[PDB]
Design a binder for this molecule. Structure first.
Ligand SMILES: Nc1nc2c(ncn2[C@@H]2O[C@H](CO)[C@@H](OP(=O)(O)O)[C@H]2O)c(=O)[nH]1
Length: 329
């Protein structure tokens, strides 16, 4: 009768908008249960061949499906009340470009509240199986350390941290609920890769995985807002250059492109960023997911909605010193 309990707290503003997703599909807002499931496939998947079939077998065997009951019961409870959103703060705090789609929804009045930094949430994992309560907790751990939840969370919203917990599974694995140093970060990542393999038993894949991903940090900043604002300056220059670039390519003079001297040269990979707390101080966190399946830079929708790609790392690392936490690449 296993049970893991956690209290997580927002580091950056968190927008949980599952509700808007039926009318507006641009408003993808992954929940905690949602994002845990994702991170599981990115831990496990570091061990499966390009064997999507088997990964789906294990994934459904843990989290459940339409033809299966879950072996783990994930209970999430807000402990804070949503606060009224202050549209004045995007100009004031210099987050006007990264969180543009939020400000837009705010001004239209589609959203009026949000969980501001400090909001707490209780997550409680229960399972009769030990193999399962270990995999579920690594997923939650991965979510907090490398991921995010909510609308625009791959751009700094929904960054989380653990403030109190009662985990017999992290104790067992020799893991922490916080990072006192960067070396702690590095070591735990390594540890999570190794332990995940064993629990399961026993050439790059098509899906995103933790094994094949770069993780970088920088700072510390004075506060969380100073970090976010750095991303916002960097993104703005990215966006300026990007717009100029794609009007050249798509609508300018027709030119015949040359095949790259290296296979899959212009296939740039997804990049999420956020805010991690290391030693009590705020760091910018960046993660790049390298895989084989393709993802076009070019989608039918406004270019301020286009996914940020790995070629963005320049616009941070050329402007302030960056530290590599995880080098798989
Ligand atoms: N953990 C996490 N996953 C996300 C976030 N945004 C999108 N995703 C997941 O990653 C993918 C990025 O588009 C999405 O589809 P996918 O499930 O097909 O991989 C989604 O499930 C996020 O902010 N956090």
């Amino acid at each position: 009768m296993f049970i893991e309990e956690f209290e997580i707290e927002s580091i950056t503003s968190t927008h949980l908008l599952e509700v808007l997703t039926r009318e507006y599909p641009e408003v993808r807002s992954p929940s905690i249960k949602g994002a845990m499931r994702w991170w599981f496939r990115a831990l496990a998947g570091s061990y499966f061949g390009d064997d999507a079939q088997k990964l789906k077998e294990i994934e459904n065997q843990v989290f459940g499906s339409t033809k299966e009951r879950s072996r783990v019961k994930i209970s999430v409870t807000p402990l804070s009340s949503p606060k009224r959103l202050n549209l004045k703060e995007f100009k004031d705090k210099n987050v006007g470009y990264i969180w543009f789609s939020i400000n837009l929804l705010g001004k239209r009045g589609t959203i009026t509240h949000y969980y501001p930094p400090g909001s707490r949430f209780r997550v409680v994992l229960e399972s009769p199986s030990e193999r399962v309560i270990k995999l579920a907790t690594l997923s939650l751990w991965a979510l907090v350390s490398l991921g995010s939840v909510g609308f625009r969370s791959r751009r700094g919203t929904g960054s989380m941290k653990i403030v109190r917990a009662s985990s017999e599974v992290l104790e067992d694995l020799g893991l922490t609920t916080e990072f006192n140093s960067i070396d702690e970060f590095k070591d735990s990542l390594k540890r999570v890769l190794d332990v995940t393999g064993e629990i399961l038993g026993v050439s790059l894949p098509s899906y995103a995985t933790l094994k094949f991903s770069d993780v970088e940090v920088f700072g510390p900043g004075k506060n969380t807002w100073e970090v976010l604002a750095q991303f916002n300056n960097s993104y703005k220059e990215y966006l300026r250059r990007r717009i100029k670039k794609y009007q050249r390519i798509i609508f300018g003079l027709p030119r015949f492109k040359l095949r790259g001297v290296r296979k899959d040269l212009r296939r740039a990979s997804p990049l999420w960023f956020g805010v991690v707390e290391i030693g009590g101080k705020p760091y910018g966190r960046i993660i790049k997911f390298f895989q084989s399946t393709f993802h076009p830079e070019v989608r039918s929708k406004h270019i301020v909605d286009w996914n940020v790609l790995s070629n963005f790392d320049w616009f941070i690392s050329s402007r302030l010193p960056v530290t590599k936490v995880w080098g798989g690449w």
